[PDB]
């Protein structure tokens, strides 16, 4: 089997991407944030504290003839940005872009933190990291990908995120019309539960490539590109007026600037992030100070190849017995 679903930016800045997901019988369609940095499929629901729901579409398990309470199961998750959610668990039928999993753990939110409430466009998350990170207790649950794996034509999914435009998540096949040149594959460590790999280095604009190992994760659920402070300083030094602002919480730059590109290495290959991808607009409405799309990972404890990086490539998440990552230009 295969599946193919369009993923759409939630706003003009590509702050995140939502993908429609069918849950239950008859189908209830919710727009979920596909997150290769976590491993829980959770949704706003009829159980979510009413004051914490503000415009989201909810899953109502009592209206699904295929929903079953997973007795005794609870979940609770905290994300890198400090957001969180928790609740109980159902199993139900879940379909993505024509690909159907029966008995998928659907984690029903009883509580969500303010950042989730305040984002009316995201109805929940669909985790695509390794199932070892799944938070369901006392019986850990499998991701949608993990559950679908055996049935897929090939045990892979691909992320093709757009810049200021829709893109595609495919399951079970590689669309050879979706990228240019060849796909370069690189090793993955699953030891932290992430799609963790090592970039071979970087360049700033038309500058010479610096060969240096950068360990990090491929994370579709993170907006920006988070890299070591040395690398990030080297980038923003090429932007007149750019500075790191403690008060804003990162590098800012004059909105009148033309940003240079940023290249990262995948083995011997090179992915080029155009300068415009690194512009996340005024820090506050009407400001002439703009927020940068490349930020320091210092104090995160890991480097994160988030959407800013991933949207510059066609990315293969290879879930073979030894997982790997593939990157192509597009």
3-state SS track over 224-293: CEEECHHHHHHHHCCCCCCEEECCCCEEEEECCCCCCCEEEEECCEEEEECHHHHEEEECCCCCCEEEEC
Residues contacting 288, CB < 8 A, separation 6+? 254, 255, 256, 282
DSSP reduced 3-state for 126: strand
Give the sign of the dihedral formed by CA 80, CA 275, CA 10, CA 244: positive
CA dihedral 204, 194, 19, 81 (to 10 degrees): -70
Q: Which of 64, 85, 199, 297 is catalytic?
A: 199
Decide if 221 contacts 38 (C-beta within 8 A): yes
Give the sign of the dihedral formed by CA 74, CA 169, CA 308, CA 14: negative
Q: Are residues 110 and 182 in the same domain?
A: no
Q: How far apart are CA 171 and CA 99, in angstroms?
A: 8
Angular region, 142: left φ>0, alpha ψ -120 to 50, beta rest: beta
Q: Are residues 181 and 325 in the same domain?
A: yes
Kind of pairing between the strands at 167-171 and 3-9:
antiparallel
DSSP reduced 3-state for 104: strand
Q: How far apart are CA 25 and CA 87, in angstroms?
A: 21
CATH number at residue 14: 2.40.70.10
Decide if 290 contacts 307 (C-beta within 8 A): no
Q: How far apart are CA 126 and CA 3, in angstroms?
A: 15
Burial 73-109 (b: 16+ CB within 10 A, else e): bebebebbeeeebbbbbbbbbbbbbebebeebbbbbb
Q: 182: burial class by Cβ within 10 Å (0-12, 13-18, 19+)?
A: exposed
Q: Are residues 247 and 277 in the same domain?
A: yes
Rounded to 5°, the CA angle 150-101-309 comes to: 75
Q: Are residues 30 and 167 in the same domain?
A: yes
Q: How far apart are CA 52 and CA 56, in angstroms?
A: 10
Q: How far apart are CA 95 and CA 104, in angstroms?
A: 10
CB atoms within 10 A of CB 181: 10
The DSSP code sequence of 128-165 is -S-GGG---BSS----HHHHHGGGSSSSEEEEE--SSS
How many angstroms separate the Cα of 330 from the Cα of each of 176, 270, 271, 311?
11, 12, 9, 10
Q: Are residues 161 and 199 in the same domain?
A: no
Q: Are residues 139 and 230 in the same domain?
A: no
DSSP reduced 3-state for 202: strand
Given 3-state DSSP classes, what are the helix, strand and coil percentages for the chain, each rounded to the nearest 5? 10, 45, 45
* List of E strands, 36-67: 41-43
Task: Among 141, 174, 207, give the residue marking a domain's end.
Answer: 174
Helix and strand element counts for the chain (H, E): 4, 24
Q: Are residues 87 and 68 in the same domain?
A: yes
Phi, psi of 225 (to 5 degrees): -105, 115
Task: Among 154, 174, 194, give the residue marking a domain's end.
Answer: 174
Task: Among 130, 159, 174, give the residue marking a domain's end.
Answer: 174
Q: Which of 14, 33, 35, 219 is catalytic?
A: 35
Decide if 39 contacts 33 (C-beta within 8 A): no
Q: Residue 128: name the closest of 240, 262, 220 by CA.
A: 220
Owner of token pair 């990170």: 133
Is there a catalytic annotation at residue 199? yes
Decide if 224 contacts 294 (C-beta within 8 A): yes
Q: Are residues 141 and 27 in the same domain?
A: yes
Q: Are residues 101 and 215 in the same domain?
A: no
Q: Are residues 74 and 206 in the same domain?
A: no
Q: Are residues 251 and 202 in the same domain?
A: yes
Q: How far apart are CA 107 and CA 93, in angstroms?
A: 13
Q: Are residues 166 and 145 in the same domain?
A: yes
Q: Residue 33: name the closest of 113, 106, 108, 128 by CA.
A: 128
Domain residues for the domain of 196 are 175-330
Phi, psi of 52 (to 5 degrees): -100, 0
Q: How far apart are CA 327 and CA 209, in angstroms?
A: 18
DSSP reduced 3-state for 187: strand
Give the sign of the dihedral formed by CA 45, CA 142, CA 176, CA 211: positive
Q: How far apart are CA 270 and CA 184, in angstroms?
A: 9
Q: Residue 159: name the closest of 17, 321, 10 by CA.
A: 17
Q: Residue 148: name the closest of 325, 3, 318, 324 by CA.
A: 3
Domain total for the chain? 2
């Amino acid at each position: 089997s295969t599946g193919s679903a369009t993923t759409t930016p939630i706003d003009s800045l590509d702050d995140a991407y939502i993908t429609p997901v069918q849950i239950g019988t008859p189908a209830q369609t919710l727009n979920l944030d596909f997150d290769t940095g976590s491993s829980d499929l959770w949704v706003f629901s009829s159980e979510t504290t009413a004051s914490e729901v503000d415009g989201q579409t909810i899953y109502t398990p009592s209206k699904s003839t295929t929903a079953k309470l997973l007795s005794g199961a609870t979940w609770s998750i905290s994300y890198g940005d400090g957001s969180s959610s928790s609740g109980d668990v159902y199993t139900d039928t879940v379909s993505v872009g024509g690909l159907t999993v029966t008995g998928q753990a659907v984690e029903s939110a009883k509580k969500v933190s303010s950042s989730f409430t305040e984002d009316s466009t995201i109805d929940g998350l669909l985790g695509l990291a390794f199932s070892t990170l799944n938070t369901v207790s006392p019986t850990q649950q499998k991701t949608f990908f993990d559950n679908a794996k055996a049935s897929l034509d090939s045990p892979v999914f691909t992320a093709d995120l757009g810049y200021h435009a829709p893109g595609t998540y495919n399951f079970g096949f590689i669309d050879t019309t979706a990228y240019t040149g060849s796909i370069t594959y690189t090793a993955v460590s699953t030891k932290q539960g992430f799609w963790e790999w090592t970039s071979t280095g970087y360049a700033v604009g038309s500058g010479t490539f610096k060969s240096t190992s950068i360990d990090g994760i491929a994370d579709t659920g993170t907006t920006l590109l988070y890299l070591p402070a040395t690398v990030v300083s080297a980038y923003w030094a090429q932007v007149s007026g750019a500075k790191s602002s403690s008060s804003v919480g990162g590098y800012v730059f004059p909105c009148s600037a033309t940003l240079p590109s940023f290249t990262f290495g995948v083995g011997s290959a090179r992915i080029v992030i155009p300068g415009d991808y690194i512009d996340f607009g005024p820090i506050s409405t009407g400001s002439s100070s703009c927020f940068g799309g490349i930020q320091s990972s210092a104090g995160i404890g890991i480097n994160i190849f988030g959407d800013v990086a991933l949207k510059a490539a066609f990315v293969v998440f290879n879930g073979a017995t030894t997982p790997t990552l593939g990157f192509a230009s597009k």
